[PDB]
Design a protein around this ligand. Structure first.
Ligand SMILES: Nc1ccc(S(=O)(=O)Nc2ccccn2)cc1
Ligand SMILES: *[C@@H]1O[C@H](CO)[C@@H](O)[C@H](O)[C@H]1NC(C)=O
Length: 342
């Protein structure tokens, strides 16, 4: 069980102005800290944010949050469930800003909602330093789906935050799960992200912003474009046939030639974008998210599980014989890997 703490700085808020927060389980024999960013789509104007407030309110407000959460997958403290980091300090950061973790805008007489995802992450880091993060050796910022994209947008900001606060010895790294999307042509017929950034006052990493320049910051929400601009080490986990990617592409699974070619090309394109990503795990499965699922230990690429790959990554940041870090399936159809989940 991780225990809830609402932010002491109550001006850093969820969408509706309630305080943001984090769930924490300390492990005082460990200098490793895992901060996990929850996912869950987004909203990009008054009308669809109003709809989200009616039926997804826990993603917009802390007023109904429970006082505890069970840690699962990479957040589990049991070695059998989490071979990688079972003895780490565990933090789960709820997603209540609806902005892919990019926003820096307060509620006001001009704004019905607050979009403060980027500031929530910084305030969580600040308050954790007084609860033991100051003695850390590694801070791993992880996240799934919208939280995986949030890792890409914020990992270098966390690294700069700790440097300027006077903690240059804490090594900041990122783990982005199911947040690596392609801005491809649909099977049947990015503007929402463009509108969202203006609505949220969204922020992107500075080097990426300077490449694409004003009006074009939406480009930095796509992993293959923002990743080359990042300085912190980042491990990328992405199913080659991600279900959220197929949903936005208007694909719903008797497959005929046109759809067969479309699906095969999508996998080839995703594999291509990961060619120069040295720390990555990309199986040929139809699925979405993995790292906080209890059976995340089950899938393998070329005989290597994801917990092993992450361990090999740790060793590489001190090629390794028998301990690979770049694991991308070459077979071209969903479930051509026998270890895919059912
Ligand atoms: N082809 C394509 C894929 C995803 C999207 S998105 O609106 O959901 N934008 C994003 C971007 C990064 C993370 C999550 N959503 C739009 C178009
Ligand atoms: C609380 O957070 C806000 C937003 O980041 C900031 O302006 C303010 O200085 C913070 N308060 C304190 C006491 O640090």
């Amino acid at each position: 069980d991780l225990r809830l703490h609402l932010l002491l700085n109550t001006s850093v808020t969820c969408n509706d102005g309630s305080p943001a927060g984090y769930y924490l389980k300390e492990s005082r024999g460990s200098r490793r800290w895992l901060l996990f960013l929850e996912g869950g789509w987004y909203c990009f104007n008054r009308e669809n944010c109003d709809s989200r407030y009616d039926t997804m309110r826990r993603l917009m407000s802390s007023r109904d949050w429970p006082r505890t959460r069970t840690g699962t997958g990479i957040l589990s403290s049991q070695p059998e469930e989490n071979p990688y980091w079972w003895n780490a300090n565990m933090v789960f950061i709820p997603y209540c800003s609806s902005d892919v973790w990019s926003g820096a805008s307060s509620k006001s007489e001009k704004n019905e909602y607050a979009f403060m995802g980027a500031l929530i992450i910084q305030e969580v880091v600040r308050e954790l330093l007084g609860r033991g993060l100051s003695g850390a050796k590694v801070l791993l910022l992880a996240g799934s789906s919208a939280g995986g994209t949030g890792v890409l947008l914020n990992v270098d900001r966390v690294a700069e935050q700790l440097e300027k606060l006077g903690y240059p010895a804490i090594q900041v790294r990122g783990l982005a799960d199911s947040g690596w999307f392609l801005d491809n042509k649909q099977y049947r017929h990015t503007e929402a992200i463009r509108r969202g950034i203006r609505y949220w006052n969204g922020v992107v990493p500075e080097r990426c912003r300077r490449q694409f320049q004003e009006g074009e910051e939406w480009n930095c929400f796509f992993g293959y474009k923002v990743y080359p601009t990042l300085r912190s080490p980042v491990f990328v986990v992405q199913w080659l046939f991600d279900e959220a990617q197929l949903t936005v592409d208007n694909v719903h699974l008797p497959v005929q030639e046109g759809l067969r070619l479309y699906i095969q090309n999508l996998g080839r394109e995703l594999r291509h974008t990961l060619k120069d990503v040295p720390a990555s795990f990309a199986p040929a499965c139809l699925s979405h998210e993995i790292i906080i699922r209890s059976h995340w230990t089950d899938v393998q690429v070329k005989g290597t599980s994801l917990p092993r790959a992450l361990h090999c990554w740790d060793r590489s940041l001190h090629p390794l014989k028998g301990c690979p870090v770049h694991l991308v399936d070459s077979c071209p159809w969903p479930h051509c890997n026998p270890s895919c989940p059912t």
